[PDB]
Amino acid sequence: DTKEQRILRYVQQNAKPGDPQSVLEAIDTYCTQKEWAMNVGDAKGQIMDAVIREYSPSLVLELGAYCGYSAVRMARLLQPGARLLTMEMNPDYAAITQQMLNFAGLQDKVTILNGASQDLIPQLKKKYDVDTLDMVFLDHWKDRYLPDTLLLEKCGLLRKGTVLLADNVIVPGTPDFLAYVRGSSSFECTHYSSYLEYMKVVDGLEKAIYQGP
Ligand SMILES: Nc1ncnc2c1ncn2CCOCCNC(=O)c1cc(-c2ccc(F)cc2)cc(O)c1O
Ligand SMILES: [K+]
Ligand SMILES: [Mg+2]
């Protein structure tokens, strides 16, 4: 019995099947009252909602799924026919994410890819029929934000206007990624100050819009 398994069971027993809003609410209730978990949370989740609504992306890539919280949060705002691809290297987390999406009724909109982003990113064009990404949500190992961004560019996966949205740029922090995008002529950045999920600790999201080479 793991924390992630307890979060999934709590959702299944305290949310309505096929209702993504009740799913997010049960996850946020559980993590506020019972056990903290590394889901994006409601404070950063609200900023993520505002960004999704502004861009209405047709194809989103998320790096790091955990329990499926951010996938549910993004997929519930996607337009009919829009898709989300989420890469999760932990197989136990990938199985929880799948079941979470299944319960929320969003399974048709999301594809969970169980594996390392550095291995999966180069397969996106040929195997997954991807041309370019409309948006990327970075929420995996913090030291992978910068190499995976550089890898997405190399693979031709970024277009003029691709929205990169990075969680935890303050806590645990992503200093090399943050310095790079803020210093590059190929990105237009915006910092969205917020709070670490379920905590009175300052955190933030960085939006970095790819401008081409
Ligand atoms: N395909 C892939 N390739 C490479 N890596 C991959 C992958 N797929 C998954 N992973 C690994 C991603 O799993 C964990 C990443 N998330 C976090 O580490 C995280 C940590 C905190 C936190 C913890 C403790 C504190 F005290 C304060 C804050 C908060 C957050 O919001 C976080 O997101
Ligand atoms: K999450
Ligand atoms: Mg995070």
mmCIF file of C-alpha atoms and ligand atoms in Angstrom:
data_model
loop_
_atom_site.group_PDB
_atom_site.id
_atom_site.type_symbol
_atom_site.label_atom_id
_atom_site.label_comp_id
_atom_site.label_asym_id
_atom_site.label_seq_id
_atom_site.Cartn_x
_atom_site.Cartn_y
_atom_site.Cartn_z
ATOM 1 C CA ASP A 1 0.000 0.000 0.000
ATOM 2 C CA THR A 2 1.776 3.162 -1.342
ATOM 3 C CA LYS A 3 0.807 6.877 -1.010
ATOM 4 C CA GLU A 4 -0.142 6.916 -4.751
ATOM 5 C CA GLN A 5 -2.360 3.810 -4.312
ATOM 6 C CA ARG A 6 -4.038 5.507 -1.284
ATOM 7 C CA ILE A 7 -4.629 8.678 -3.428
ATOM 8 C CA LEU A 8 -6.191 6.569 -6.243
ATOM 9 C CA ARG A 9 -8.472 4.648 -3.801
ATOM 10 C CA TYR A 10 -9.510 7.954 -2.142
ATOM 11 C CA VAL A 11 -10.531 9.391 -5.589
ATOM 12 C CA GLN A 12 -12.457 6.225 -6.584
ATOM 13 C CA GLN A 13 -14.359 6.397 -3.233
ATOM 14 C CA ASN A 14 -14.854 10.177 -2.979
ATOM 15 C CA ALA A 15 -15.297 11.447 -6.553
ATOM 16 C CA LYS A 16 -17.889 10.877 -9.304
ATOM 17 C CA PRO A 17 -16.815 8.586 -12.212
ATOM 18 C CA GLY A 18 -16.500 10.603 -15.446
ATOM 19 C CA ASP A 19 -16.369 13.935 -13.530
ATOM 20 C CA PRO A 20 -12.794 15.400 -13.773
ATOM 21 C CA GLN A 21 -13.590 18.352 -11.452
ATOM 22 C CA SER A 22 -14.687 16.015 -8.595
ATOM 23 C CA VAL A 23 -11.412 13.999 -9.232
ATOM 24 C CA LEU A 24 -9.174 17.128 -8.805
ATOM 25 C CA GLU A 25 -11.198 18.181 -5.717
ATOM 26 C CA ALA A 26 -10.810 14.726 -4.036
ATOM 27 C CA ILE A 27 -7.046 14.749 -4.836
ATOM 28 C CA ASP A 28 -6.687 18.251 -3.315
ATOM 29 C CA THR A 29 -8.814 17.290 -0.295
ATOM 30 C CA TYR A 30 -6.750 14.131 0.343
ATOM 31 C CA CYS A 31 -3.411 15.966 0.064
ATOM 32 C CA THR A 32 -4.484 18.867 2.295
ATOM 33 C CA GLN A 33 -6.019 16.736 5.074
ATOM 34 C CA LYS A 34 -4.227 13.360 4.931
ATOM 35 C CA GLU A 35 -0.849 13.193 3.100
ATOM 36 C CA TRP A 36 1.084 15.733 1.007
ATOM 37 C CA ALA A 37 1.842 14.615 -2.557
ATOM 38 C CA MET A 38 3.745 16.178 -5.477
ATOM 39 C CA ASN A 39 0.653 16.908 -7.641
ATOM 40 C CA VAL A 40 0.678 20.445 -9.205
ATOM 41 C CA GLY A 41 -2.082 21.346 -6.727
ATOM 42 C CA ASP A 42 -4.884 23.886 -6.870
ATOM 43 C CA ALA A 43 -2.870 27.176 -6.629
ATOM 44 C CA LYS A 44 -0.565 26.376 -9.593
ATOM 45 C CA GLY A 45 -3.423 24.376 -11.179
ATOM 46 C CA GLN A 46 -5.512 27.550 -11.521
ATOM 47 C CA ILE A 47 -2.619 29.303 -13.442
ATOM 48 C CA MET A 48 -2.208 26.163 -15.604
ATOM 49 C CA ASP A 49 -6.017 26.369 -16.325
ATOM 50 C CA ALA A 50 -5.705 30.054 -17.394
ATOM 51 C CA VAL A 51 -2.754 29.207 -19.760
ATOM 52 C CA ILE A 52 -4.589 26.164 -21.270
ATOM 53 C CA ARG A 53 -7.735 28.299 -21.868
ATOM 54 C CA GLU A 54 -5.684 31.049 -23.552
ATOM 55 C CA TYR A 55 -3.832 28.821 -26.025
ATOM 56 C CA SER A 56 -6.473 25.985 -26.520
ATOM 57 C CA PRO A 57 -3.632 23.571 -27.572
ATOM 58 C CA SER A 58 -4.439 20.797 -30.021
ATOM 59 C CA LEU A 59 -1.447 18.653 -28.921
ATOM 60 C CA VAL A 60 0.143 18.838 -25.482
ATOM 61 C CA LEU A 61 3.133 16.915 -24.174
ATOM 62 C CA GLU A 62 3.583 16.477 -20.417
ATOM 63 C CA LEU A 63 6.893 15.285 -18.968
ATOM 64 C CA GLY A 64 6.224 13.497 -15.678
ATOM 65 C CA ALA A 65 2.690 12.301 -14.898
ATOM 66 C CA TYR A 66 2.961 11.173 -11.237
ATOM 67 C CA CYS A 67 -0.709 10.294 -10.320
ATOM 68 C CA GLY A 68 -2.391 11.945 -13.313
ATOM 69 C CA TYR A 69 -3.494 15.156 -11.502
ATOM 70 C CA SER A 70 -2.013 17.611 -14.066
ATOM 71 C CA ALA A 71 -3.095 15.306 -16.980
ATOM 72 C CA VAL A 72 -6.724 15.389 -15.665
ATOM 73 C CA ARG A 73 -6.448 19.156 -15.102
ATOM 74 C CA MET A 74 -5.202 19.795 -18.684
ATOM 75 C CA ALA A 75 -7.288 17.123 -20.520
ATOM 76 C CA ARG A 76 -10.576 18.333 -19.001
ATOM 77 C CA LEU A 77 -10.067 21.773 -20.739
ATOM 78 C CA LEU A 78 -8.953 20.408 -24.092
ATOM 79 C CA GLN A 79 -11.204 20.926 -27.122
ATOM 80 C CA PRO A 80 -12.903 17.853 -28.775
ATOM 81 C CA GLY A 81 -10.243 15.999 -30.745
ATOM 82 C CA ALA A 82 -7.324 17.661 -28.890
ATOM 83 C CA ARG A 83 -4.821 15.209 -27.380
ATOM 84 C CA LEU A 84 -2.368 14.974 -24.508
ATOM 85 C CA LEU A 85 0.707 12.749 -24.475
ATOM 86 C CA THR A 86 2.240 12.172 -21.022
ATOM 87 C CA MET A 87 5.626 10.508 -20.375
ATOM 88 C CA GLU A 88 6.119 8.722 -17.037
ATOM 89 C CA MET A 89 9.272 6.740 -16.270
ATOM 90 C CA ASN A 90 7.986 5.218 -13.018
ATOM 91 C CA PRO A 91 5.814 2.147 -13.962
ATOM 92 C CA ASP A 92 3.906 2.251 -10.654
ATOM 93 C CA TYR A 93 3.025 5.943 -11.256
ATOM 94 C CA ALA A 94 2.145 5.228 -14.915
ATOM 95 C CA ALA A 95 -0.362 2.528 -13.769
ATOM 96 C CA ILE A 96 -1.872 4.972 -11.205
ATOM 97 C CA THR A 97 -2.078 7.721 -13.864
ATOM 98 C CA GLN A 98 -3.889 5.373 -16.284
ATOM 99 C CA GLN A 99 -6.472 4.345 -13.640
ATOM 100 C CA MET A 100 -6.896 8.014 -12.582
ATOM 101 C CA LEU A 101 -7.608 9.034 -16.230
ATOM 102 C CA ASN A 102 -9.917 5.982 -16.648
ATOM 103 C CA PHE A 103 -11.965 7.022 -13.557
ATOM 104 C CA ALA A 104 -12.171 10.699 -14.722
ATOM 105 C CA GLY A 105 -13.393 9.508 -18.159
ATOM 106 C CA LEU A 106 -10.461 11.155 -20.009
ATOM 107 C CA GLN A 107 -8.749 7.979 -21.341
ATOM 108 C CA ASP A 108 -9.693 8.788 -24.995
ATOM 109 C CA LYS A 109 -7.911 12.160 -24.811
ATOM 110 C CA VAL A 110 -4.704 11.043 -23.070
ATOM 111 C CA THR A 111 -1.917 8.594 -23.917
ATOM 112 C CA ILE A 112 0.409 7.697 -20.996
ATOM 113 C CA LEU A 113 3.834 6.615 -22.280
ATOM 114 C CA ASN A 114 5.708 4.578 -19.626
ATOM 115 C CA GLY A 115 9.412 5.391 -20.145
ATOM 116 C CA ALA A 116 12.242 7.991 -19.899
ATOM 117 C CA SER A 117 11.564 11.282 -21.776
ATOM 118 C CA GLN A 118 15.126 11.294 -23.271
ATOM 119 C CA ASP A 119 14.335 7.902 -24.861
ATOM 120 C CA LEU A 120 10.697 8.691 -25.891
ATOM 121 C CA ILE A 121 11.097 12.296 -27.193
ATOM 122 C CA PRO A 122 13.159 11.098 -30.300
ATOM 123 C CA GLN A 123 10.404 8.557 -31.213
ATOM 124 C CA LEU A 124 7.544 11.153 -31.299
ATOM 125 C CA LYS A 125 7.711 11.992 -35.056
ATOM 126 C CA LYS A 126 8.109 8.429 -36.472
ATOM 127 C CA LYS A 127 6.252 6.279 -33.872
ATOM 128 C CA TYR A 128 3.608 8.648 -32.506
ATOM 129 C CA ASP A 129 2.900 10.582 -35.747
ATOM 130 C CA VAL A 130 3.765 13.944 -34.137
ATOM 131 C CA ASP A 131 4.603 16.936 -36.390
ATOM 132 C CA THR A 132 5.110 19.748 -33.772
ATOM 133 C CA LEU A 133 3.884 20.339 -30.184
ATOM 134 C CA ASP A 134 1.501 23.132 -29.280
ATOM 135 C CA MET A 135 2.398 22.992 -25.603
ATOM 136 C CA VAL A 136 4.808 21.188 -23.275
ATOM 137 C CA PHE A 137 4.215 20.810 -19.513
ATOM 138 C CA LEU A 138 7.523 20.101 -17.678
ATOM 139 C CA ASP A 139 7.078 18.370 -14.310
ATOM 140 C CA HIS A 140 9.610 15.512 -14.269
ATOM 141 C CA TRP A 141 13.133 15.370 -12.647
ATOM 142 C CA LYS A 142 14.189 18.998 -12.237
ATOM 143 C CA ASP A 143 17.677 18.413 -13.784
ATOM 144 C CA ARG A 144 15.906 17.154 -16.976
ATOM 145 C CA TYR A 145 14.015 20.382 -17.908
ATOM 146 C CA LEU A 146 16.956 21.935 -19.728
ATOM 147 C CA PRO A 147 18.342 18.779 -21.545
ATOM 148 C CA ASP A 148 14.780 17.738 -22.592
ATOM 149 C CA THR A 149 14.024 21.268 -23.899
ATOM 150 C CA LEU A 150 17.229 21.159 -26.006
ATOM 151 C CA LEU A 151 16.304 17.633 -27.139
ATOM 152 C CA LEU A 152 12.771 18.803 -28.201
ATOM 153 C CA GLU A 153 14.326 21.557 -30.352
ATOM 154 C CA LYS A 154 16.887 19.085 -31.940
ATOM 155 C CA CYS A 155 14.075 16.665 -32.860
ATOM 156 C CA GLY A 156 12.123 19.442 -34.662
ATOM 157 C CA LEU A 157 9.223 19.082 -32.198
ATOM 158 C CA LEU A 158 8.996 22.860 -31.405
ATOM 159 C CA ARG A 159 7.278 25.416 -33.643
ATOM 160 C CA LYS A 160 7.029 29.248 -33.473
ATOM 161 C CA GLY A 161 4.556 29.726 -30.617
ATOM 162 C CA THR A 162 5.065 26.358 -28.775
ATOM 163 C CA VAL A 163 4.209 27.088 -25.107
ATOM 164 C CA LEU A 164 6.630 25.530 -22.592
ATOM 165 C CA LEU A 165 5.055 25.604 -19.076
ATOM 166 C CA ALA A 166 7.452 24.494 -16.297
ATOM 167 C CA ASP A 167 6.396 23.555 -12.775
ATOM 168 C CA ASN A 168 8.668 24.069 -9.705
ATOM 169 C CA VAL A 169 11.009 26.710 -11.106
ATOM 170 C CA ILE A 170 11.456 27.924 -7.449
ATOM 171 C CA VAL A 171 10.947 24.717 -5.370
ATOM 172 C CA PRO A 172 12.809 22.387 -5.791
ATOM 173 C CA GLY A 173 13.965 24.831 -8.501
ATOM 174 C CA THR A 174 15.352 24.408 -12.032
ATOM 175 C CA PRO A 175 18.218 27.006 -12.098
ATOM 176 C CA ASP A 176 19.926 25.949 -15.360
ATOM 177 C CA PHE A 177 16.566 25.730 -17.236
ATOM 178 C CA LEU A 178 15.379 29.101 -15.822
ATOM 179 C CA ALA A 179 18.710 30.884 -16.688
ATOM 180 C CA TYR A 180 18.719 29.434 -20.195
ATOM 181 C CA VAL A 181 15.165 30.281 -21.324
ATOM 182 C CA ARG A 182 15.306 33.763 -19.690
ATOM 183 C CA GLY A 183 18.640 34.445 -21.418
ATOM 184 C CA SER A 184 17.675 33.077 -24.857
ATOM 185 C CA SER A 185 16.419 35.098 -27.850
ATOM 186 C CA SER A 186 14.499 31.974 -28.883
ATOM 187 C CA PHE A 187 12.155 32.219 -25.815
ATOM 188 C CA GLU A 188 9.747 34.889 -24.535
ATOM 189 C CA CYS A 189 9.365 34.131 -20.803
ATOM 190 C CA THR A 190 6.801 34.961 -18.134
ATOM 191 C CA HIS A 191 7.084 33.996 -14.471
ATOM 192 C CA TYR A 192 3.859 33.156 -12.588
ATOM 193 C CA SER A 193 4.531 33.384 -8.842
ATOM 194 C CA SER A 194 2.495 30.952 -6.818
ATOM 195 C CA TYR A 195 2.878 28.444 -3.980
ATOM 196 C CA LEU A 196 4.151 24.899 -3.649
ATOM 197 C CA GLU A 197 1.219 22.443 -3.772
ATOM 198 C CA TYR A 198 -0.639 22.144 -0.416
ATOM 199 C CA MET A 199 2.018 24.350 1.338
ATOM 200 C CA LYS A 200 2.587 27.969 2.450
ATOM 201 C CA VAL A 201 5.892 27.902 0.475
ATOM 202 C CA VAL A 202 6.553 30.183 -2.514
ATOM 203 C CA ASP A 203 6.880 28.397 -5.897
ATOM 204 C CA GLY A 204 6.111 29.353 -9.478
ATOM 205 C CA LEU A 205 5.513 28.380 -13.078
ATOM 206 C CA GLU A 206 7.620 29.651 -15.941
ATOM 207 C CA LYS A 207 6.002 30.024 -19.357
ATOM 208 C CA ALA A 208 8.574 30.142 -22.163
ATOM 209 C CA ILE A 209 7.232 30.630 -25.677
ATOM 210 C CA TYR A 210 9.491 29.272 -28.413
ATOM 211 C CA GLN A 211 10.201 31.922 -31.109
ATOM 212 C CA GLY A 212 12.088 29.759 -33.640
ATOM 213 C CA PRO A 213 15.844 29.764 -34.419
HETATM 214 N N1 LIG B 1 9.998 10.380 -18.791
HETATM 215 C C1 LIG B 1 10.734 10.835 -17.690
HETATM 216 N N2 LIG B 1 12.048 11.218 -17.828
HETATM 217 C C2 LIG B 1 12.766 11.656 -16.765
HETATM 218 N N3 LIG B 1 12.236 11.743 -15.532
HETATM 219 C C3 LIG B 1 10.927 11.347 -15.302
HETATM 220 C C4 LIG B 1 10.132 10.906 -16.398
HETATM 221 N N4 LIG B 1 8.920 10.611 -15.909
HETATM 222 C C5 LIG B 1 8.892 10.853 -14.636
HETATM 223 N N5 LIG B 1 10.105 11.314 -14.217
HETATM 224 C C6 LIG B 1 10.445 11.729 -12.859
HETATM 225 C C7 LIG B 1 9.425 12.767 -12.380
HETATM 226 O O1 LIG B 1 8.899 12.376 -11.097
HETATM 227 C C8 LIG B 1 9.107 13.355 -10.047
HETATM 228 C C9 LIG B 1 9.197 14.758 -10.660
HETATM 229 N N6 LIG B 1 8.551 15.724 -9.777
HETATM 230 C C10 LIG B 1 9.203 16.189 -8.675
HETATM 231 O O2 LIG B 1 10.327 15.797 -8.421
HETATM 232 C C11 LIG B 1 8.537 17.195 -7.775
HETATM 233 C C12 LIG B 1 9.010 17.393 -6.458
HETATM 234 C C13 LIG B 1 8.387 18.342 -5.626
HETATM 235 C C14 LIG B 1 8.877 18.551 -4.230
HETATM 236 C C15 LIG B 1 9.324 17.447 -3.461
HETATM 237 C C16 LIG B 1 9.790 17.648 -2.169
HETATM 238 C C17 LIG B 1 9.794 18.949 -1.607
HETATM 239 F F1 LIG B 1 10.242 19.136 -0.349
HETATM 240 C C18 LIG B 1 9.350 20.044 -2.360
HETATM 241 C C19 LIG B 1 8.889 19.853 -3.666
HETATM 242 C C20 LIG B 1 7.281 19.095 -6.111
HETATM 243 C C21 LIG B 1 6.816 18.906 -7.417
HETATM 244 O O3 LIG B 1 5.765 19.645 -7.881
HETATM 245 C C22 LIG B 1 7.434 17.975 -8.257
HETATM 246 O O4 LIG B 1 6.979 17.797 -9.514
HETATM 247 K K K B 2 0.615 16.493 -11.121
HETATM 248 MG MG MG B 3 5.721 19.597 -9.875
#
